[PDB]
Design a binder for this molecule. Structure first.
Ligand code: FDA
Length: 570
């Protein structure tokens, strides 16, 4: 009847809008989107291509709070997320970069059939429409490889209309030679190491931010089989009652803006796309998760899957600055250094120490999931990551350099692959209550040591020629606070005191085999259910090197094909 649809997609965000778009391509399938926020079509702080940061702390920022971070000096961290049609794509930094090919290949090696770079690449392309650079932008260093960028996809990608060459970016380009990191034409072809003028998620015909709604929703909102409920919060799924021990989702419980708490039903499937900080909570509230936590919070267990909310992996981000003799200008540049780029002469002794620590990191992570992940299993997971870092020389850092205003040069930077793992769990069965989110930042020695290594490497870049002729001094942290010959620990103290979340959480409904603590299968179906999937950052089993939206769009495009395929029987 009147609350029944074929599919229900929970969360009209980065990933959810893809799935809703693709599923509604079949004009005889009905799709309901549920979104807690609303349209931001006309929110200027979203729409503004130069508006990054403006929306922080507003009504469209969930502004989730972590617990005290006991490995990082005790402070709680704000974890930002978009509450809006388009989700976190509405408030993010707009950077478009993907992942290392061999790091996606690891997903299949781990036991997830069909997930490799070769499998995913067509779906990156399918999502994308890249606008080639103008002359001004080419002189500023903009480039791309036509073979790895799409031209028909919903997500417009391009460079700023204001991009121009300037003394800072020109000097940086040459100074990177001294540092040993080559220029590359396109970081998005599976090999990310180098430095590059990366494109952004931007509509250059409007000069607006290209969020997921501008891409996958508004051009398609004429489809009468695609339905949207804004200001509508999904609280939990409910189930079909009947002695199928395997759980069949019947629908979703929802709260509307003006108070009505009701149900909507799905004839085929329910797709959960609320993000890595909410999808696992929705599962827990629906009885899918750790039965000890569920029972404690007065929820009946429906599926005993105790790693829902576990294996949370995030990065942390720090910032450095210097000051020119005069005004610094030009492009914003990304660098993706490997372990040997960052540590140079000392790489092999750094690698040996790391090697010698893996089993201890694994032993220590066991207690985080109260023994639900076994030591053996964490050792094998950490070995896959170690082998990427060292054997395959994937990038271990992102470093952004940009003009900071007038005299200023600013660098933002993060380690890509820390080993720390945490979790997120409901604090009660009230959907409106804040979860306990613990990413465990700085838990393991590598996580801090690598960040300090990156900082030391930036400091050296700023002092290298020809860039050094432009730069009078370092202003942050500056030599007074952290002297030129300072030890790793001196850096780690400062970085701990000054870090923020990089807002890249993954893993909270991980796609791995159930036997090593997976929550979803290789077709993104929740274990123990017939017809529930998770399609968002929750399912990435490991961190990726680049900025998340590109990979999340690709995963949602591929997921969509799998869902369609599965329907051509049932
Ligand atoms: C400040 C900042 C800056 C950056 C980034 C993040 C942040 C916070 N990122 C990361 C990237 O933007 C992010 O990982 C993805 O947008 C996440 O997409 P998801 O689909 O997983 O969740 P996303 O958060 O997009 O979608 C979840 C949706 O579910 C909704 N929702 C949640 N709970 C619900 C409920 N119970 N009921 C109904 N709806 C619900 C939310 O409101 C939201 O619309 C980024 N990436 C990048 O590629 N380039 C960049 O430059 C940056 N920079």
């Amino acid at each position: 009847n009147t609350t029944t649809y074929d599919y229900i997609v929970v969360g009209g965000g980065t990933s959810g809008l893809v799935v809703a778009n693709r599923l509604s391509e079949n004009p005889d399938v009905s799709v309901l989107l549920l979104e807690a926020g609303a349209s931001v079509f006309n929110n200027p702080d979203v729409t503004n291509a130069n508006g990054y940061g403006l929306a922080f702390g507003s009504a469209i920022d969930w502004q989730y709070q972590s617990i005290n971070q006991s490995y990082a000096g005790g402070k709680q961290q704000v974890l930002r997320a978009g509450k809006a049609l388009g989700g976190t794509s509405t408030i993010n930094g707009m950077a478009y970069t993907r992942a290392e090919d061999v790091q996606i290949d690891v997903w299949q090696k781990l036991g997830n059939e069909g997930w490799t770079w070769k499998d995913l690449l067509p779906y990156y392309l399918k999502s994308e429409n890249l606008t080639a650079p103008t002359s001004s932008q080419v002189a500023a260093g903009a480039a791309y490889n036509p073979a790895v960028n799409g031209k028909e996809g919903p997500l417009k990608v391009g460079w700023s209309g204001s991009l121009a060459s300037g003394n800072l970016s020109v000097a940086l380009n040459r100074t990177f030679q001294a540092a040993g990191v080559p220029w590359v034409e396109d970081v998005n072809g599976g090999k990310m190491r180098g430095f590059n003028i990366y494109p952004s998620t931007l509509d250059v015909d409007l000069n607006v931010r290209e969020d997921a709604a501008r891409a996958y929703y508004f051009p398609y909102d004429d489809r009468k089989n695609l339905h949207l409920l804004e200001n509508t919060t999904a609280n939990r799924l409910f189930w079909k009652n009947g002695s199928a021990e395997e759980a069949i989702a019947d629908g979703v419980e929802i709260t509307s803006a003006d108070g009505k708490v009701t149900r909507v039903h799905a004839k085929k499937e329910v797709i959960i796309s609320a993000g890595a900080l909410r999808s696992p909570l929705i599962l827990e509230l629906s009885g899918v998760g750790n039965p000890t936590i569920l029972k404690k919070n007065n929820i009946t267990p429906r599926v005993d899957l105790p790693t829902v909310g576990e294996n949370l992996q995030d990065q942390f981000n720090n910032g450095m600055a210097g000051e020119g003799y005069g005004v610094l200008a030009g492009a914003s540049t990304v660098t993706y250094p490997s372990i040997s780029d960052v540590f140079g002469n000392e790489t092999d002794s750094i690698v040996a120490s790391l090697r010698s620590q893996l089993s201890d990191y694994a032993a220590a992570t066991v207690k985080v999931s109260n023994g639900h992940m076994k030591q053996e299993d964490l050792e094998r997971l950490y070995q896959l990551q170690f082998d990427l870092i060292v054997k395959d020389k994937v990038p271990i850092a992102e470093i952004l350099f940009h003009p900071g205003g007038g005299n200023a040069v600013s660098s933002e930077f993060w380690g890509l692959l820390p080993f720390a793992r945490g979790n997120i769990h409901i604090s009660s069965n009230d959907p409106t209550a804040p979860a306990a989110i613990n990413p465990n930042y700085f838990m393991f020695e590598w996580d801090g040591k690598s960040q300090a290594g990156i900082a030391k490497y930036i400091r050296k870049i700023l002092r290298s020629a020809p860039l050094n002729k432009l730069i009078a001094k370092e202003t942050k942290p500056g030599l007074s606070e952290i002297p030129a010959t300072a030890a790793d620990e001196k850096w780690v103290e400062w970085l701990k005191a000054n870090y923020r979340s990089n807002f890249h959480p993954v893993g909270t409904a991980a796609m791995m085999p159930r036997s090593i603590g997976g929550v979803v299968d290789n077709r993104l179906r929740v274990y123990g259910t017939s017809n529930v999937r998770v399609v968002d950052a929750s399912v990435l089993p490991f961190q990726v090197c680049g900025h998340l939206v590109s990979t999340l769009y690709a995963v949602a495009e591929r997921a969509s094909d799998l869902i369609k395929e599965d329907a051509k029987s049932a």
